[PDB]
Amino acid sequence: GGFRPSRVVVVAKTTRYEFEQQRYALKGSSYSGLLERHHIHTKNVEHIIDSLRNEGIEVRLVKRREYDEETVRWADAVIAAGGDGTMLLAASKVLDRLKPVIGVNTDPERSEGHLCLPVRYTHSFPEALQKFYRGEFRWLWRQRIRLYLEGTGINPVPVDLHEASGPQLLPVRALNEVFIGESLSSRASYYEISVDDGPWEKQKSSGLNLCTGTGSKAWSFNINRVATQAVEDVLNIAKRQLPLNRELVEKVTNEYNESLLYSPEEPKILFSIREPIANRVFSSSRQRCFSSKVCVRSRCWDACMVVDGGTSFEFNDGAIASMMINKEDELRTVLLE
Amino acid sequence: GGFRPSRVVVVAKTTRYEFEQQRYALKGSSYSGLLERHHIHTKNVEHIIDSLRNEGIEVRLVKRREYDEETVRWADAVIAAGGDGTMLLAASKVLDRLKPVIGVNTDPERSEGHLCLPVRYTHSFPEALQKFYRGEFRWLWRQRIRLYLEGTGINPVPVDLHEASGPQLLPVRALNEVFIGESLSSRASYYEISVDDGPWEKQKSSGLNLCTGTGSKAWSFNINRVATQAVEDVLNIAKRQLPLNRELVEKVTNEYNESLLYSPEEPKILFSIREPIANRVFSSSRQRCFSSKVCVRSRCWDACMVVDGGTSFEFNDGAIASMMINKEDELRTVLLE
Ligand SMILES: NC(=O)c1ccc[n+]([C@@H]2O[C@H](COP(=O)([O-])OP(=O)(O)OC[C@H]3O[C@@H](n4cnc5c(N)ncnc54)[C@H](OP(=O)(O)O)[C@@H]3O)[C@@H](O)[C@H]2O)c1
Ligand SMILES: NC(=O)c1ccc[n+]([C@@H]2O[C@H](COP(=O)([O-])OP(=O)(O)OC[C@H]3O[C@@H](n4cnc5c(N)ncnc54)[C@H](OP(=O)(O)O)[C@@H]3O)[C@@H](O)[C@H]2O)c1
Ligand SMILES: [Fe+3]
Ligand SMILES: [Fe+3]
């Protein structure tokens, strides 16, 4: 049950310093902080490449603009070298459930890397390669959401945010989430939603978030999690309208918040109405729920459907989107100690 | 203590139908629904104008593009004829704490009108005029936020969303709120905030909301309010880790949520971090709090400071904004039964 690829594409993030270069000594604030960050990431990319080549593996190192589907098909395995952002980028071009995608955190002090290998492998990559070769790991297939688009006036062409018609399959899958909303941050969004083929219900809010189990810890977590002060208050209306302290409040906050996370393997969508407006003229139903399918009718003026923060689609009045989870969209990942 | 103005400007909202006209029978969905809405609003505007003129009051009726500061100064009183959106529009051009601004809800079935006179006066406007003339009302001065801008690379020119340097006063006041965030809905916002001259703390989130007491019921309410299911859950961790029902859950939800609203007369800012990202690489302090002053240092790429959903200012890395509450920005409104 081992695993040793012969061909690997590494797709490495572009650093802020590289960004500033491709755009023009100490300008404003974090001047040489950018250069320190750049050297850490570069050191780590070289460690990964050297380790692979030392195992006899043929490696091709690309940035964003040269990470393409052709390079993915050439490779036996994709390695994202950066942070969770780099894993989303890499996963966006993999649509084959058998193709391994592995993430290495190249700046652990500034990159969370929740989708990447544990931090120790960043500077101990031959060790990870040995664990793979020896089968000392397990496969984790992360469920992903796929998007269909139909209706009138639709435009299914994807837009890369990093620079009547029947249902058509959009060319990207969501590993984290589909966000839906007006482009203007302060403009309320208006749509109708049907969950698991239920009746259509109108909604006014600041958007909709539809996440996977993998995405349950990302945007969705910060949309729905309850502040420890909010439960201090809520538990105080309780005794007014058991004793409390920092102990009990922290216990109840974390149980509630853990209830927002679910397994990346579970094929269900966590769907949240983001900041709904109720009041005396509009009304809203549930705020969050699980489902296997949610369809959205756009009633918006200048709105987008945004996949993993990276790929955007037009979604204006007349457009109808269907999200669901399909086994062939499972993203093949690894789990190490 | 009566009140009868001689000159009045009425600023009336533009209807969707007027919008469609100024842009070109039954196109898509709500076809003649737009025309029904248009006739209701027009009927009501005529009732207001006829009532005023029947009291001997000279009236000038304007839409958005002709509501200007000159017309405001000509008038003894401004009347916004539409919904809360129209009140925000009208208030945006009044900077004199002595100048009355009155809102009439011209479509009560579709307009909340929380800033407007009670719905009965929409078709009983001579009655409101008599109550004013007789002193059968009270004045309500609603506190507003003012914005200063300083730093490097700043651009203080306002942008109408409806189509090194020392601190300079921005030309609009917030009756509802100042929103601050990246323009791209899915891009995390990065800034430093100082509350009541406290130490600077970095923050990563989906933006900041800074509202008045008037704005406490608007965006801020939907940013912070707790769902009745979330307290059902929270009260269930409580008994596990008094009896519950629909009764007790609704009682505790509404006490908690009422704690988010405060008097429009109170001169303090309710400040919320909108969807903060904590995790193992960033950290956040309080989520919401009251204050008299909050200063924000922009660390953003393409961000805006948006006042009452209507006026937008550039706010990118190097810009520094100061918000506070000043008595001369009080907005003079009326309260009737
Ligand atoms: N207010 C919010 O919570 C908010 C706003 C916008 C986007 N997001 C999330 O950020 C995603 C895009 O990430 P990005 O790296 O391109 O931009 P980003 O601004 O760097 O993402 C914000 C942080 O979330 C972390 N993250 C990403 N995916 C995660 C996951 N599945 N579980 C736990 N944490 C995760 C990122 O990890 P790294 O540090 O390793 O990059 C980063 O620390 C989006 O799909 C969305 O979920 C959240
Ligand atoms: N997710 C959200 O909650 C969200 C998102 C964007 C904006 N907003 C709020 O909407 C304001 C702009 O309003 P808009 O009419 O131009 O666009 P809008 O989309 O029509 O406003 C949304 C609703 O809030 C109501 N509202 C406005 N001010 C209020 C207040 N002080 N207290 C209670 N309710 C209020 C509006 O009343 P009417 O029906 O009479 O118009 C409307 O029903 C912004 O300042 C912001 O506060 C809220
Ligand atoms: Fe990132
Ligand atoms: Fe409105």
SS (H, E, C) B99-137: CCEEEEECCCCCCCCCCCCCHHHHHCHHHHHHHHHCCCC
Using the Cα atoms of residue A297, residue A90, residue A221 and residue B195 in order, give the sign of their dihedral: negative
Which H or E run includes B254? helix B246-258
Q: Which residues have C-beta within 8 Å of that of residue A220, sequence separation ≥ 6?
A: A177, A209, A211, A260, A270, A272
**Distance separating alpha carbons of residues B66 and B130, to the nearest angstrom:** 29
| Residue B267: closest CA among B150, B174, B160 | B174
**Contact (Cβ atoms closer than 8 angstroms) between residue A98 and residue A329:** no
CB contact under 8 A, B251 and A238: no
**Contact (Cβ atoms closer than 8 angstroms) between residue A323 and residue A329:** no
Size of interface A-B (CB pairs under 8 A): 123
The tokens for A98 are 């058998």
Judging contacts by C-beta atoms under 8 Å, the chain A residues touching residue B237 are 251-252, 255-256
Nearest atom in ligand 1 to A214's CA: 31
CB contact under 8 A, B275 and A251: no
CB contact under 8 A, A275 and B223: yes
Q: Which residues have C-beta within 8 Å of that of residue B91, sequence separation ≥ 6?
A: B80, B101, B144, B173, B175, B308, B331
**Distance separating alpha carbons of residues B8 and A239, to the nearest angstrom:** 53
Pairing of strands B101-105, B77-82: parallel
CB contact under 8 A, B238 and A238: yes
**Contact (Cβ atoms closer than 8 angstroms) between residue B188 and residue B277:** yes
**Contact (Cβ atoms closer than 8 angstroms) between residue A8 and residue A45:** no
Judging contacts by C-beta atoms under 8 Å, the chain A residues touching residue B306 are 185-186
**Distance separating alpha carbons of residues B200 and A47, to the nearest angstrom:** 37
**Contact (Cβ atoms closer than 8 angstroms) between residue A172 and residue A158:** yes
Q: Does A163 touch chain B (CB under 8 A)?
A: no
> Which among A110, A161, A229 has the least Cβ separation from residue B281?
A110
**Method of structure determination:** X-ray
The b/e string for A41-58 (b: 16+ C-beta within 10 A; e otherwise) is beebbebbbebbeebebe
Alpha-carbon radius of gyration of chain A = 22
Q: How many C-beta atoms surround the C-beta of residue A280 within 10 A?
A: 11
3-state secondary structure of A202: strand
**Distance separating alpha carbons of residues A151 and A255, to the nearest angstrom:** 42
**Distance separating alpha carbons of residues B291 and A71, to the nearest angstrom:** 54
**Contact (Cβ atoms closer than 8 angstroms) between residue A133 and residue A5:** no
Classify residue A315 by its DSSP letter: -
Give how far A309 is from chain B: nearest CA, Å.
Answer: 6
Helices (H), A123-176: 125-133
Which H or E run includes B220? helix B219-224
**Distance separating alpha carbons of residues B89 and B63, to the nearest angstrom:** 10
Which H or E run includes B222? helix B219-224
**Distance separating alpha carbons of residues B335 and A228, to the nearest angstrom:** 38
The β-bridge partners of B105 are: B82
Pairing of strands B101-105, B319-325: unpaired
Pairing of strands A208-211, A177-182: antiparallel
The tokens for A102 are 């592995």
Angstrom resolution of this structure:
2.6
CA dihedral B110, B113, B114, B116 (to 10 degrees): -160
Amino acid at A210: L
- Kindly state the greatest CA–CA separation across chain A: 70
Q: Does A252 touch chain B (CB under 8 A)?
A: yes
Helices (H), chain A: 16-21, 33-54, 69-74, 84-92, 125-133, 219-224, 228-240, 246-258
**Chain A neighbours among B 66-95 (CB < 8 Å)?**
none
Comparing alpha-carbon positions, the chain B residue that sits nearest to A225 is B275
**Contact (Cβ atoms closer than 8 angstroms) between residue A51 and residue A43:** no
Comparing alpha-carbon positions, the chain B residue that sits nearest to A306 is B186
> Which among A252, A280, A288 has the least Cβ separation from residue B112?
A280
**Chain A neighbours among B 27-46 (CB < 8 Å)?**
28-29
**Distance separating alpha carbons of residues B293 and A61, to the nearest angstrom:** 50
Q: Which residues have C-beta within 8 Å of that of residue B206, sequence separation ≥ 6?
A: A222, B181, B188, B189, B274, B275
Does 3.40.50.10330 match the CATH number of domain A7-143+332-335?
Answer: yes
**Distance separating alpha carbons of residues B337 and B332, to the nearest angstrom:** 17
CB contact under 8 A, A309 and B219: no
